[PDB]
Amino acid sequence: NNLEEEVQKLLYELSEIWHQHDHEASREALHRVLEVLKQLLEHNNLEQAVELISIAVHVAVRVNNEHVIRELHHLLRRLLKQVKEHNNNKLYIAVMSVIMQLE
């Protein structure tokens, strides 16, 4: 399945950036993930958006990319709205935990 495979690759890329403190790789990877998150939200792929935004938050905080942090605040706003409208209690708590880690 092309979408799951690609999300899994994006998660791996960001995970390796986080473990290696790879500041050089991070800016390109974070901008890409920001665009993927917006698509995922548009197509109501909320499970995958939650797993990707969590590792995106970890990386953005670790490398202190203040622009991406600001963008992630907005995407978290939208994601929380969308998980609440779909009444998904497990996703709600996951998004809250990410919000608490970004803050």
Author numbering: 1 to 103
What did the paper state?
We reasoned that to enable systematic design of binders to convex protein target sites it would be necessary to generate scaffold sets with overall concave shapes. The selected 7476 scaffolds, which we refer to as 5HCS (5 helix concave scaffolds) throughout the remainder of the text, have a wide range of curvatures. Our method for computationally designing small but concave proteins to bind to convex protein target sites expands the space of the protein surfaces that can be targeted by de novo protein design.
Because of the therapeutic importance of the target, and receptor extracellular Ig domains more generally, we next sought to evaluate the generality of our approach by designing 5HCS based binders to CTLA-4. Deep sequencing of a site saturation mutagenesis library of the most enriched binder, 5HCS_CTLA4_0, showed that the designed core and interfacial residues of the binder were highly conserved, suggesting the design folds and binds target as in the computational model. The circular dichroism spectra indicates a helical structure with peaks at 208 nm and 222 nm consistent with the design model and was unchanged by heating to 95 °C, indicating high thermal stability.
